[PDB]
Design an enzyme around this catalytic site. Structure first.
Site, PDB file in Angstrom:
ATOM      1  N   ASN A  52       0.825  -1.196   0.000  1.00 43.90           N
ATOM      2  CA  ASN A  52       0.000   0.000   0.000  1.00 43.90           C
ATOM      3  C   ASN A  52       0.861   1.248   0.000  1.00 43.90           C
ATOM      4  O   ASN A  52       2.035   1.222   0.366  1.00 43.90           O
ATOM      5  CB  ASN A  52      -0.919   0.050   1.208  1.00 43.90           C
ATOM      6  CG  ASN A  52      -0.160   0.104   2.492  1.00 43.90           C
ATOM      7  OD1 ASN A  52       1.016  -0.216   2.535  1.00 43.90           O
ATOM      8  ND2 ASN A  52      -0.820   0.524   3.549  1.00 43.90           N
ATOM      9  N   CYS A  53       0.243   2.347  -0.389  1.00 47.40           N
ATOM     10  CA  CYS A  53       0.828   3.675  -0.379  1.00 47.40           C
ATOM     11  C   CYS A  53      -0.105   4.607   0.385  1.00 47.40           C
ATOM     12  O   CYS A  53      -1.070   4.173   1.010  1.00 47.40           O
ATOM     13  CB  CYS A  53       1.065   4.157  -1.807  1.00 47.40           C
ATOM     14  SG  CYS A  53       1.593   5.854  -1.932  1.00 47.40           S
ATOM     15  N   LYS A  54       0.191   5.903   0.336  1.00 44.69           N
ATOM     16  CA  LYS A  54      -0.720   6.884   0.911  1.00 44.69           C
ATOM     17  C   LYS A  54      -2.076   6.832   0.232  1.00 44.69           C
ATOM     18  O   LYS A  54      -3.112   6.722   0.889  1.00 44.69           O
ATOM     19  CB  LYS A  54      -0.132   8.280   0.775  1.00 44.69           C
ATOM     20  CG  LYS A  54      -0.974   9.363   1.393  1.00 44.69           C
ATOM     21  CD  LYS A  54      -0.300  10.704   1.251  1.00 44.69           C
ATOM     22  CE  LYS A  54      -1.094  11.783   1.931  1.00 44.69           C
ATOM     23  NZ  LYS A  54      -2.378  12.002   1.226  1.00 44.69           N
TER      24      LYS A  54
END
Lengths: 498, 498
Positions: free
Chosen positions: A396-398
């Protein structure tokens, strides 16, 4: 209408203004003739021939959102006398809310792409959360009804933000052998919730949703769980946030995610999930989760000047002990989950041993603190190893579209390169000519561009920056040995200040 | 002609354009009527009444230098057909060279200011290098002849850049008791010299010049040395550079300075200096130097996000062992130079013991890595301690006017506050009301503003920034409890991009 620009083709903008105008029309009510004024000029430009992106076109598109906010503030003041500061703040909040609503209501559909190389055919599939269904309804309790959640919906407490299942497979012998399958999502914490209690609760619900998707990736486990038997599940989660509060509150984001994973993997605690069975009825299943949570950081903020390296390594140490055992010397024998997998004597031992050795090497020399030509050296191998030993990889990322998309491309390139009976490349090494050709094809023929457009309205990637002091760049010019392709991956990404 | 602006008074600009126009006239030859065109408009504005700094005035002054460079490039192309890039590069180099020449040729004179507080009269004196003279000529071998070296003369190999002797004294009993005397200069390395051999040689010559000035600060030692006797000299040097090469090559600057000090303090090596005696004849003296070299870093780059802390601490550890001995526990007894001074049983013991204890405290908790309300906590105490034990304190910056000026003000404030029979303030503490009044008076009535104008053409300080993310500010708003005074210290400093 076809003389495409070198950068920022007219049709891409063409779509962008329509989306922004639709949002403004929604908030106002499709009654202002001013909106019709530039809408008519927009329709005039619709039939106009395509052109190179002149500075006027780019500037007009770039400043359109600000002009719309100013117009809304003026309408607000005329209707109700408010100070400029109050009207401006209220207008910005209302405009963002309307945009999220519209972007959420559009249909979400699976994305399929085909890639050919050396007489081999590969297929990339992106399955959105609204399409994971057995029977006729999505498995998730709070039904999606064919719609989704965008990366900008930061106050949602019921759904994970940008949830997709990513698969790459090769066609052989009239069949499709799956080479890799993983889960990509946004961050697990609601950003702007103020109540700490609701923050923790929202993180819990999002994490449970990721677990539900991971279970769906393994049909045999799903069938056993639906039969009433408790099921054990192993998951490897990789976060790509920099973990420092100096610039953008990405630090607190990380502790929120780590806290959520800890609350679901409390020892001896059995987890209950709700799933829509094939009859459209909610049914409870029992899971024994086991999560190894990582965070690496792949920005310039983390690799060039270096932020949160110490903060993240405290988490990474625990996760490695969980994954490889208590002895991390590169020459020792693997333990932990890898050891348990190898104890079955699978015909997979060669790849697993190589990956474990390389990971220990990187950890020993702290090579992940710099980008020796390729910054995803540790994250990419963690995901590949997790798939080998039959766990579920998730990253995941932001927002789940920029750094997540780049890691998606990196993994696909390595899997395809390995599938040709090769070995794995050494850590921190630039791709060769053939690898560069593979990477160029992947970056354009993966589903990332469509994810970008679906989630935002324009195709692009924010990872491609080209900062002014040349020592602050991440060196993708060398990994992607093509200027035009590099400029194509970074599409309208610079015009989405929002 | 007197309605002063709140910021950027018209007269300050009034001087600025004349200086820039004079440089342009010098390079061209005072023949272009275009120069006379805006010169005549400038003379028209000379008699105009003073006004608040309108955005037009500030913008015109800010962009004047760029316009002049463009004009020179156009003249160059017309006279000799050259490409735009080549003409632009050549024009910039020529313009900078002319400006340094003009700024060097102006007279350099001593600066005297008077300050009154609580019925006490203090005097601040800045003595330029061209004024340190016995007889009728400056003591330095390569004579100054009443002229100086600016901070922008980065290719000079014969002179130290911006050398001043700073003194504060109080008038008592019809006499002037000296309270503090120190040496402030620019950095000891020529920036843009390419040959490493000439770089090292130039650093040597500059360091020798600082030593000559320090010797002049002690008349009794100077007389002994002039009598033919070898003299021992103790010097404490404090550098204020951040020591990282990421942004501006301040790292290599530091190793150049440290290498120069090491080459002069080689064990058993006696140093020979040339000095102009009272008869104007060069004479050789013999010095036994002893230098403790420090570097701290007081920028946002070093305190907020943190650069070169590890690099500098390797130097600071050696210097502390040289200054305080091998035991740095805060409760132990002082050794090193401090121990030798205390062994004479001076009536100064109280202040010396307090300063040594505080320095050990700061070092133990690494308090100098943050700015607990005041960033010069370690540098300021090092200089004050050096003066107490009869060494010579010297400090420097990149250019010797911005961070050097701020440290000058900090030291003067503390000396004045202490002179009222008080004690010393605790580390990392904001000044009280009375201390704030002292600091406000010092910042304006010290000679720093005149040094700024002499060295640049406009008064100001680059340390006052007010960055956009509020967590990156150094907190001088609190130390200087006055908005107008803070805006007055930062003068035309933002219009000197050069």
């Amino acid at each position: 209408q076809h003389q495409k620009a070198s950068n920022h083709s007219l049709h891409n903008l063409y779509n962008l203004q329509r989306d922004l105008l639709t949002v403004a029309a929604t908030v106002l009510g499709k009654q202002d003739p001013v909106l019709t004024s530039m809408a008519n000029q927009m329709e005039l430009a619709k039939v106009k021939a395509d052109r190179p992106a002149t500075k006027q076109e780019e500037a007009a598109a770039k400043a359109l959102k600000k002009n719309l906010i100013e117009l809304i503030a003026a309408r607000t003041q005329q209707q109700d006398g408010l100070p400029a500061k109050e009207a401006h703040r209220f207008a910005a909040v209302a405009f963002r809310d309307a945009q999220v609503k519209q972007l959420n209501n559009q249909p979400w559909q699976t994305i399929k792409n085909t890639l050919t190389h050396n007489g081999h055919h590969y297929t990339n599939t992106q399955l959105p959360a609204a399409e994971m269904k057995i029977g006729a309804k999505d498995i998730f309790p709070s039904a999606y009804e064919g719609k989704g959640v965008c990366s900008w919906d930061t106050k949602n407490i019921h759904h994970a933000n940008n949830l997709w299942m990513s698969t790459v497979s090769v066609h052989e012998d009239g069949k499709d052998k799956t080479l890799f399958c993983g889960i990509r999502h946004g961050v697990l914490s609601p950003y702007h919730e103020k109540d700490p209690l609701l923050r923790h609760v929202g993180a819990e619900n999002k994490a449970k949703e990721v677990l539900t998707a991971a279970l769906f990736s393994k049909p045999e486990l799903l069938n056993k769980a639906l039969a009433g038997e408790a099921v054990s599940l192993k998951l490897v989660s990789v976060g790509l946030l920099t973990a420092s509060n100096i610039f953008g509150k990405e630090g607190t984001m990380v502790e929120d995610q780590m806290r959520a994973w800890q609350s679901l993997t409390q020892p001896g605690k059995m987890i209950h999930l709700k799933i829509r069975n094939k009859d459209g009825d909610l049914q409870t299943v029992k899971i024994k989760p086991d999560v190894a949570a990582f965070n690496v950081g792949v920005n310039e903020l983390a690799l060039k000047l270096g932020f949160g390296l110490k903060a993240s390594d405290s988490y990474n140490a625990e996760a490695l002990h969980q994954l490889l055992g208590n002895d991390l010397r590169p020459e020792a024998r693997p333990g932990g989950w890898v050891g348990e997998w190898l104890a079955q004597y699978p015909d997979n031992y060669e790849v697993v041993n190589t990956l474990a050795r390389q990971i220990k090497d990187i950890w020993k020399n702290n090579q992940h603190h710099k980008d020796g030509g390729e910054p995803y050296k540790l994250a990419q191998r963690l995901a590949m190893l997790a798939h080998e030993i039959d766990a579920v990889p998730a990253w995941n990322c932001k927002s789940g579209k920029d750094r997540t998309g780049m890691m998606d491309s990196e993994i696909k390139r390595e899997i395809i390169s390995l599938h040709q009976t090769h070995m794995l490349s050494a850590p921190g090494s630039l791709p060769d000519s053939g690898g560069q050709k593979i990477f160029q094809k992947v970056l354009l023929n993966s589903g990332n561009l469509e994810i970008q457009k679906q989630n935002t309205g324009g195709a692009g990637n924010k990872v491609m920056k080209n900062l002014s002091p040349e020592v602050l760049n991440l060196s993708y010019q060398k990994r992607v040995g093509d200027e035009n392709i590099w400029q194509s991956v970074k599409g309208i990404s610079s015009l989405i200040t929002s």
